[PDB]
């Protein structure tokens, strides 16, 4: 029950805890975040950071509330308040990272960065089949988009826990993979730790005792004597679930994943689910770990597969995992979350952050707003990674499509810079996408969330509303718009006339 | 709770309630059978019948106990005691049938009778696949056994609720069916009403509201407002389940079964599960029916598919459904159940009774006892139907194999008689396989369960023990052993010398 009461320093701003709550930060009076058994649909970390260089850490989950000008934190384990003498957000990040989530030195597969990614989810939804995937792939190429990592999303397999292609819809999956390789794509498969609970796979997993067991609400029943599997309700239905605490579950998962790699030439895996909330209730694990750690240990599987992507996470800061922002709606509200979510992810140790799916990644959203799709693409362009799903050529008229292609072109022109800071982030953990406050502390940027720095020297200010005008707050120094070449005096807010094609970006010259 | 309390008449014997309890009948002091929520792994009917012509019926389930010489029945609904004036078992049977389960006039597909049946369950267990099924079928013909109905058992499909062949193990199921038809076989598929509860089929059934719903233990929650499915534990795991009370579930089931017939040319279906026990607990059904009626209504699907077989049943006496004795163990005790089980099934309105599987129908029993297999085959031979699974040519030496073949030959010689009483059974409900007590009342046959009458005129007394001698109790009259042509006077017990090949059968000549 150990608790901690922290008066804010005058003017102090606090961020942390949960990536999918960044739009509610800096934490205001009234704010409440519970981490115990909740990763809020995305990545979560037991870390708060302040604009005054202060930080809070615990190895275990906590809840945080701001009442008035006081932080109240209730820890399940123990935690503490720290001050970095530098006094800035960057100092708080730097000290916290080296103490608690030091950079591993490794990168996720570089193919995830060096071209845009394509996920079949919005185009094909549940109808993942060989013919339509190949067509999507061919359409990418024919429309002049660069081949990249192609993610085949949910429903390519017979049932949950059967790690093979359903032959009804994939008559020659190896051939399909080979063709995709030929066209310059890499291929990733959606996977999860859920098992259809009346199948061969389920019975095999039950017999190997790699599932989570039902406690029967009994205080004293032990893992080693439980016989019935936990059954868990999620968005696709009801399933048994792998016990991430059980080393035999790791072996099983490897067998399945390595199988797909060897049999079909699969390059990597999109690791979905693992959300802490699925591990709550009457559940027994072999090593008696909490729901948050179940999420965390699912996350570690991706350390064995350099080409990976996670949405749900607990900890694993400083690790070579791609951390995708969760399913975004088809709204301007959501396009406005990409920067602050991404920038927060970076500070929680998730430098390799990909901003969900251009135009939105929630399938029931898919009426379509073309402008929004363009602005989504342009916002993705100079983030660490760029991910498509809905086919721009299918839903955009020709100059909206051209604008999207131009966004892709700009990313290719900036790629040496992106890759420079990406490689660096592997070594030092320092983010690729940085908030204005991280790079320009105590210069009035604490609440500027529609601008970010790509490394130290490029200020990107994507257009994220309708109109022919965009305001841009420049730090002290001189700045050169990389496209127009017009030099601007820093230290003020400027107004820029914009078209559908504009992606404001400035090089720091002084 | 309404009830009857019945003093036994002097010498009176009572049978009824549940097929799979017939070995414990006539009901002894201490006997207890609960029907409410329980069909005892097989067919059950709310009927009791006495050697003195008395009978008990209710439309609804009951419990029955004998305490000393009192037979007590406790009804969920209402019921009554009746007396047939002829004063015999057959009179009680005939009156009860005509009042409460009159013969429909119809037959199941006659191919189920006019050749031995073959079921792939014991041969292939869970590994059901095109190549091994065809090999089985070719080994049937190559060993000189007659082509029959071939039943492809559990696990031919991707998951429970997906009514299609798994293309990994059936690369050309239609072709396979065509080849089996060309060899003289017909083909049935195992089906059940369970749904893998995280799959497409599950989500479609949930959306159509054809599943059974979870009541949440609430007394007030109506079907119409429930959103979550009932999840049921069974021998293959955890599943959603169809609501048999819901007419939309009937349509869905017809769509799937008709789909299999049209696409692949499937002749019929083995309808498994449906057991009343699976319908207990926190469950809401559209027409608010009990667990027994869920079993009964699963049974009626077979009214649309003349080539059918069921194990679990509630009521539907007098109907054109094949009723299979359940999974038998590979034991002498279980071989000794075939006759009393089958004869009881006849009295409860199940004339079209097939005695499970030669040698055993429980997979986990598979030191195979060759003699036991032979005697199982011989016991099957002059029953209404004869069903193989384990390959006699794989597990028997040549004498034993020949003896099984001779059993098949005897059945073929006797088939006109079998079919005569089968066609009659459709019209009058009068069983094909009759107990000795049924044909010969008040002659001391009440507890004789190793002999049966095929129709009126053939007394069959299979060898059901080891040794060279078989006792046979002959009713008054004259009896001609059909091989030797020797005539025996009845009204006494003879001892008959037997070999492995002997199937003692006597024609009534007085
Ligand atoms: O069900 C598939 C769906 O699952 C989650 O919502 C993911 O975040 C999506 O991107 C998609 O993969
Ligand atoms: O699971 C398959 C198995 O299911 C039940 O037990 C049946 O009675 C068996 O004959 C067999 O079909
Ligand atoms: Cl969910
Ligand atoms: Cl069961």
Query: Which residues numbered 369-408 in B keep a CB inside 8 Å of some CB on A?
Result: none
Report d(CA A250, CA A263) in Å as an integer.
20
Q: How far is CA B199 from the centre of its chain?
A: 32
Tokens representing residue B475 in the block? 């009713």
Rounded CA-CA distance A493/A443 in Å is 12
A281 close contact with B: CB closer than 8 A: no
Rounded distance between C-alpha atoms, residue B386 and residue A408, angstroms? 71
For residue B273, give how far its alpha carbon lies from the nearest alpha carbon of chain A (Å).
14
Q: Is B344 in contact with B19 (CB distance < 8 Å)?
A: yes
**Nearest Cα residue to B54 out of B30, B71, B37, B33:** B71
Q: Contacts by A292-297 with C-beta closer than 8 Å and gap 24+?
A: A292/A35, A292/A36, A292/A37, A292/A39, A292/A44, A292/A60, A292/A61, A293/A244, A293/A245, A294/A243, A294/A244, A294/A245, A295/A39, A295/A244, A296/A244, A297/A244, A297/A245
Whole-Å CA distances, A507 to A274, A375, B41, B351, B383: 40, 21, 78, 90, 92
Residue bearing the CA closest to ligand 2, atom 9? B327
User: In 3-state terms, what secondary structure has residue A14?
Assistant: strand
Longest dimension (CA), chain B: 72
Contact A375, A458 (CB under 8 A): no
Q: Which residues contact B484 (CB under 8 A, 6 or more apart)?
A: none
Provide the 3-class DSSP secondary structure of residue A311: coil
The answer to whether residues B167 and A167 touch, using CB atoms and an 8 Å cutoff, is yes
Which residues have a Cβ under 8 Å from the Cβ of B128 and sit 6 or more positions away? B120, B152, B153, B154, B155, B156, B169
Of the candidates B281, B447, B303, B325, the residue with the CA atom closest to the CA atom of residue B18: B325
| Pairing verdict, β A433-435 and A452-454 | antiparallel
> Rounded distance, CA B343 to CA B49, Å?
13
Q: In sequence order, what are the beta bridge partners of B74?
A: B3, B63
Residue B161, exposed/middle/buried by CB under 10 A (0-12, 13-18, 19+)?
buried
With CB atoms and an 8 Å threshold, state whether A167 touches B167. Answer: yes
Integer Cα distance of B164 and B379 in angstroms: 36
3-state secondary structure of A394: helix
Most A CBs within 10 A among B198, B204, B263, B264, hence the mutation to make, goes to B198
Tracing tokens 């870390």 back to the chain, one arrives at: A47
Tokens found for residue A400: 């909206």
How far apart are alpha carbons A113 and A184 in whole angstroms?
14
Q: What angle do CA A286, A287, A289 make, to 5 degrees?
A: 115
Which technique was used to obtain these atomic coordinates?
Answer: X-ray
Distance from CA of B113 to the nearest CA of A (A): 34
Cα(B234) to centroid of ligand 4, in Å? 4
**How close does chain A come to B161, measured CA to CA in Å?**
11
Establish if B259 touches chain A: CB-CB under 8 angstroms. no
Characterise A87 by phi-psi region: left (phi > 0), alpha (psi -120 to 50), beta (else): left
A159 touching B (Cβ < 8 Å): yes
Q: Which of B304, B213, B206, B296 is nearest to B255 (CA)?
A: B304
DSSP structure string for B392-405: HHHHS-HHHHHHHH
User: Rounded distance, CA A222 to CA A224, Å?
Assistant: 5
Q: How far is the CA of B327 from the centre of ligand 2 (A)?
A: 7
Q: Which H helix or E strand runs over A190?
A: strand A186-191
Alpha helices in A244-308 (DSSP H): 247-264, 291-301
Other beta carbons less than 10 A from residue A196's beta carbon? 30
What six digits make up the tokens of A200? Answer: 């061969």
- Report how far residue A122's alpha carbon sits from residue A362's, in angstroms, rounded to the nearest whole number: 8
In CATH terms, the fold of domain A110-425 is TIM Barrel (3.20.20)
Which atom of ligand 2 is the closest one to the Cα of B311? 8
Nearest CA in chain B to A202: B237
Return the CATH number of B110-428, one of 3.40.50.300, 3.20.20.80, 3.90.25.10, 3.40.50.620. 3.20.20.80
User: Going by CA atoms, what residue is nearest to atom 6 of ligand 2?
Assistant: B327
Please give the interface size between A and B, counted as residue pairs whose CB atoms are below 8 Å apart. Answer: 77
Give Rg (Cα) of chain B.
Answer: 23
């Amino acid at each position: 029950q150990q608790s901690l009461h922290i008066p804010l320093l005058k003017g102090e701003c606090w961020w942390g805890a949960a990536v999918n709550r960044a739009h509610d930060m800096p934490l205001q009076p009234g704010a409440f975040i519970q981490l115990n058994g909740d990763v809020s649909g995305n990545q979560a970390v037991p870390l708060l950071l302040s604009s005054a260089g202060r930080y809070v850490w615990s190895d275990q989950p906590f809840s945080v509330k701001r009442e008035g000008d006081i932080l109240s934190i209730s820890f399940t384990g123990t935690g503490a308040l720290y001050t970095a003498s530098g006094g800035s957000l960057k100092d708080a990040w730097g000290e916290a990272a080296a103490r608690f989530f030091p950079a591993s030195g490794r990168l996720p597969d570089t193919s995830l960065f060096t071209a845009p990614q394509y996920n079949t989810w919005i185009e094909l939804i549940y109808n993942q089949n060989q013919e339509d995937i190949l067509r999507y792939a061919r359409d990418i190429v024919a429309n002049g988009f660069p081949p990249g990592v192609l993610m085949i999303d949910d429903n390519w397999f017979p049932y949950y826990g059967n790690f093979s292609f359903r032959k009804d819809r994939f008559p020659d999956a190896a051939g399909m993979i080979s063709t995709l390789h030929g066209m310059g794509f890499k291929v990733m498969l959606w996977v999860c730790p859920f098992l259809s609970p009346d199948t061969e796979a389920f019975r095999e997993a039950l017999a190997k005792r790699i599932v989570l067991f039902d406690s029967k609400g009994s205080d004293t029943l032990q893992w080693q004597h439980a016989v019935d599997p936990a059954i868990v309700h999620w968005w696709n239905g009801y399933s048994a679930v792998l016990d991430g605490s059980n080393p035999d579950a790791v072996t099983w998962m490897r067998e399945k994943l390595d199988g797909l790699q060897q049999q079909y030439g699969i390059d990597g895996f999109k690791f979905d689910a693992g959300d802490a909330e699925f591990y709550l209730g009457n559940i027994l694990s072999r090593e008696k770990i909490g729901a948050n750690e179940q999420c965390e240990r699912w996350g570690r599987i991706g350390l064995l597969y350099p080409m990976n992507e996670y949405r749900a996470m607990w900890k694993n800061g400083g690790q070579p995992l791609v951390e995708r922002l969760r399913d975004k709606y088809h709204t301007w509200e959501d396009v406005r979350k990409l920067i602050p979510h991404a920038s927060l992810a970076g500070l929680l140790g998730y430098s390799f952050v990909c901003p969900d799916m251009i135009g939105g990644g929630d399938f029931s959203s898919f009426k379509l707003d073309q402008e929004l799709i363009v602005r989504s693409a342009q916002c993705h362009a100079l983030m660490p990674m760029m991910q498509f799903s809905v086919a721009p050529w299918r839903v955009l008229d020709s100059s909206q499509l051209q604008a999207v292609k131009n966004a892709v072109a700009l990313r290719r022109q900036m790629l040496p810079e992106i890759m420079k800071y990406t490689r660096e982030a592997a070594v030092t953990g320092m983010p690729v996408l940085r908030s204005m406050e991280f790079v320009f502390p105590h210069q009035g940027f604490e609440r500027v969330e529609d601008q970010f720095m790509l490394g130290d020297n490029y200020l990107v200010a994507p257009v994220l509303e309708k109109g022919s005008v965009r305001k841009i707050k420049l730090p002290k120094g001189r700045w050169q718009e990389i496209q127009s070449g017009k030099v601007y005096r820093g230290g003020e807010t400027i107004e820029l006339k914009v078209t559908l094609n504009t992606i404001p970006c400035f090089k720091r010259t002084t």
